[PDB]
Design a protein around this ligand. Structure first.
Ligand SMILES: Nc1nc2c(ncn2[C@@H]2O[C@H](COP(=O)(O)OP(=O)(O)O)[C@@H](O)[C@H]2O)c(=O)[nH]1
Length: 170
């Protein structure tokens, strides 16, 4: 039978930025306004090869954070997510990157693929400009940056497709 490779992607970011909604939008093409760790699978294709992505949202319960970090290991790409209406969530990207590197024990962090998502761009009143987000991305690893909306689907599939491409580029 036609083989398929399995890529593990993890979503990290502050509560409320839209991680669950992004994954659900990508996999089910629905949005509608979950307590523990959840992961979903999606088939796609890259350069004519079948692949499957397994998307983890490891934001269970904060008092049990120590029990969620074992599930970082084996991640092939990390999608760091903030909301463009929430500057605090943007300011926390660096700390999310650090948590991931530490608890996933990334041995070559300078080469590990990250993708940055600025979600909720359907909201006109922003606290983070496009330019400020792009500058952070350029200056903190030159990661791909997507302005997304789970609510309207803008750039959602593109962001996840890019995650798999970045994995392949190793
Ligand atoms: N306007 C808007 N609201 C969104 C978007 N994505 C998620 N939401 C809402 O923001 C809240 C937090 O979403 P959720 O996916 O639970 O965030 P998580 O805590 O990061 O998993 C919910 O009320 C969502 O409906 C979006 O792209 N646009």
């Amino acid at each position: 039978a036609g083989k398929s490779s399995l890529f593990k992607v993890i979503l990290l970011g502050d509560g409320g930025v839209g991680k669950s909604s992004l994954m659900n939008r990508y996999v089910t093409n629905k949005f509608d306004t979950t307590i523990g760790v959840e992961f979903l699978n999606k088939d796609l294709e890259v350069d004519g090869h079948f692949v499957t992505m397994q998307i983890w949202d490891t934001a269970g319960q904060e008092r049990f954070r120590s029990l969620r970090t074992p599930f970082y290991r084996g991640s092939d790409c990390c999608l760091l997510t903030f909301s463009v209406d929430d500057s605090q969530s943007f300011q926390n990207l660096s700390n999310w990157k650090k948590e991931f590197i530490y608890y996933a024990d990334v041995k070559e962090p300078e080469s590990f693929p990250f993708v940055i998502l600025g979600n909720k761009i359907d909201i006109s009143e922003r606290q983070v400009s496009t330019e400020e987000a792009q500058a952070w991305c350029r200056d903190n690893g030159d990661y791909p940056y997507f302005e997304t909306s789970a609510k309207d689907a803008t750039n959602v599939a593109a962001a996840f497709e890019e995650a798999v491409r970045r994995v392949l580029a190793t």
